Write a protein that binds this DNA or RNA. Sequence first.
DNA 1: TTCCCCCCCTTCGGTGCTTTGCACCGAAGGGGGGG
Lengths: 412, 547
Amino acid sequence: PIETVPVKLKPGMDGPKVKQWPLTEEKIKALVEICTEMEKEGKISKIGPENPYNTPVFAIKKKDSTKWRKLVDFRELNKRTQDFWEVQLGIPHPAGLKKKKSVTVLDVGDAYFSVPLDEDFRKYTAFTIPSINNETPGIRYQYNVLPQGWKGSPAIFQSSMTKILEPFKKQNPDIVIYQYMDDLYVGSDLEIGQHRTKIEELRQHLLRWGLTTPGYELHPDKWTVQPIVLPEKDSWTVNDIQKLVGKLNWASQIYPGIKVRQLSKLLRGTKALTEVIPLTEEAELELAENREILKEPVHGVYYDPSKDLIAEIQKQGQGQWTYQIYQEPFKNLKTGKYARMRGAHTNDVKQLTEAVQKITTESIVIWGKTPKFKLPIQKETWETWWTEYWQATWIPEWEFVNTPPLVKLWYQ
Amino acid sequence: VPISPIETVPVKLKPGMDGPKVKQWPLTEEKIKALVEICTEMEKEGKISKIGPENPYNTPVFAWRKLVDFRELNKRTQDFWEVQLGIPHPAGLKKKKSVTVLDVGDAYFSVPLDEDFRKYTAFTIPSINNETPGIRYQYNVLPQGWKGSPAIFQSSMTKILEPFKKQNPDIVIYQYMDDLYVGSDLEIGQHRTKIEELRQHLLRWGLTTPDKKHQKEPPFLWMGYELHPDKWTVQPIVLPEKDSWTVNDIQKLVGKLNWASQIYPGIKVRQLSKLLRGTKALTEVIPLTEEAELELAENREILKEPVHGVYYDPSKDLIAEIQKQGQGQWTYQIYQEPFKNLKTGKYARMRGAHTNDVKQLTEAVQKITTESIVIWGKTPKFKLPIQKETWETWWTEYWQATWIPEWEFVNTPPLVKLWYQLEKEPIVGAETFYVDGAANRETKLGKAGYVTNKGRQKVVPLTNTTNQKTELQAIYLALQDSGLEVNIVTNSQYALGIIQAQPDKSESELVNQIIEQLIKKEKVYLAWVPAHKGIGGNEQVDKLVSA
DNA sequence: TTCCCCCCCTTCGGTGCTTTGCACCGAAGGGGGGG
Ligand SMILES: Cc1cc(/C=C/C#N)cc(C)c1Nc1ccnc(Nc2ccc(C#N)cc2)n1
């Protein structure tokens, strides 16, 4: 056989020259085993010292699967080939995927093994396996077939994927289809049993068409931008009204109609924090009006595809987190919270990894454009430990934050 | 027609450029006229062959034997991939029974160049003592002094050696400088057979490896270490004892101590490095203080007695222990068996202006974990001098996420504990101060004060201070004249960001005084309110400081 | 008189924010072990 699509970087830009982080001994043994197995089938080809490019490589696992899997950080090669996949062979993003009751995720990675990569491009997708203590030189390879985790791989394989999925789209026009990286999101309004049967039908259809394949449901109908609610107290003290005034001052930036001038009528003196204050009726009326404001939609909020989504994560203790996906500061496109799981005591970085995966999957479903994370964690700890509990086929873009968070205004 | 026993590696150039021309440079010392004779010998042995008028080249003679300088050409050569960038550390080396060194100096001229690229490495200079116009020249093998020659030679050597490494992995082969070191668990009775087989294998591919000197010479003195059969040390450390120390001398001493701190336990250089703050001239002599002299003598005390690390074993697991040293210094020992260390190290980086001890332990376990991953591949079992309850109380209430690998408590004081903890609820029976501090940018004058609920008021002036420091001093005033149980209200969240983190040491003495006061107290509660709203007594104290 | 890698400790500078100060951070020069 078939013609190879000419993939070229933008003029005036070089290729990826990123180094690779040291790996654990088992993540090197399994990596070598998998790479030799892929070498026996002509999927990767060893390269000589005339290829000055490199991309980082990690090893991960999958849920309910002891077998390891390889992963290549194409976060820079994706940026370099900005024009190719985005402009020439872009993928439309439906605006109705949100309304589906259930969304299931499937893997189409092995369908990418068939198409070989362009001859002129094979040098850019070069990676190396390191050695324990650097005693021996790292074993270098390059991709022969189309590579997983690269932006241009779906852009090139969409022509065949449309022919794969046309009969199912025609026979079942009540199911929406979306593709991002090697992930296929299928949206439907059916019930659990019918959805599972239809997913099995899709799996067997893909197997029959030629795909090699060796719960998992998400419900967008259970997602809602969380609103902020003012505290409710049977007994009101000076400390509580001070906290409420501070919270309303903080929230007045979000809502221009927030008023706190009547709240100061109860704090005209240097009263002690512990002592109680009876509540005046004007203050109660304004407090109820502010509560009513805190349910209205934010005025001036719109989604502009030109800019990039910015995510944030705040740890609220007890193994609980909050997040706010937004573009302009204090103008939240989406908010939410995340809680513990079946594990009694597992980890703190692992919970952050799961929260990041959930946030980015929801951002793909809602918008299709992955945000950038302001992760509240040490850079060294994250870089050292993220791979141990990360189960995904792609990597977001995160910048770490070193500021004092005084945000107790998200979880009570 | 030329010959080639191994595969050639294609090389390109940066597009749009051609071959340069270089001015004459002085020749070597041991040869001044023998260049033509050695060129004739090279042409006889096939490394060099004459050509026609290919393209304008002009290259000098380097200032051993003749060496052609391609420095101007090296700016036209394709970029290559460097093979070895991180040197192995001796601790992560397995214990070999015997070692043997072979010479591969001449084998560097036995890797054929690219047939398409041979026409670029051409020498175009005649003799010096005689009178000749000039002969032709081009390399049929890897040139010396080329940008890409070392990488190509290393790749070819690895390709040649890999078939032998496949059959018998027990023998390890390393290529440093221009030799080959072979280590094996076989005794000398059978080591020679393997050495002979390796030599025959290298000869089959066209390389001869004769060497006699270092086959019986351990230690090996490699990169600054003293590798023996089953131990390793550092090369001997020289400590200057000159009475007068300049800035450069202190820098040299602290660098040498940092290098020597990898095998000698309990080396502290934190006090010495402080002497270099604010001084940059090497001709300025900095007088020595008491703490610096004491720590310098302490460092000298370890180095007289020699100790040797042991070689790693992959059949066991490694344990890392951390000990405190005060002022923010930590020392760790990594060993696979007690009293037989694999490595030692120190950590003293001051990450941030305001930090405490538990955060330092968190930042110190990370370094050990990363170093173990780089060197040994497995994370070690930590044995920290901290209590699990303190760790939980700190990490469940801190905003930053963090993790520690499997670690066990060991009782060896000084233990690491959080000195003071605030209260989350207002105290019953505690006077509620309302503090404020104001400053002026023009007059550089400020006023810090507080008003209590009982009616007590206090204001103090300050000079050459900013608003943040005025507010911190107002909190200081609130803490000074108060009971054990204290409630405070401040309208600035910067002091809240400082105090709430609960630091143990700071680079500003005011915060140090604040912790010194908060240690004596029993229960402290700090609250934040927005200013400019006349909330509580904040308006009164704001008026007092502003008027 | 090179240049680069690795490591460490200050100094410096521009962001991010608590706002012409203050905190955090990376990268620049010096000091070590070699080519
Ligand atoms: C880094 C390294 C440096 C030299 C030395 C280079 C130089 N000069 C020699 C060898 C063979 C190696 N490579 C390896 C690999 C695995 N285990 C070991 N252990 C080991 C190291 C030194 C001695 C000795 N004597 C014995 C065993 N060395």
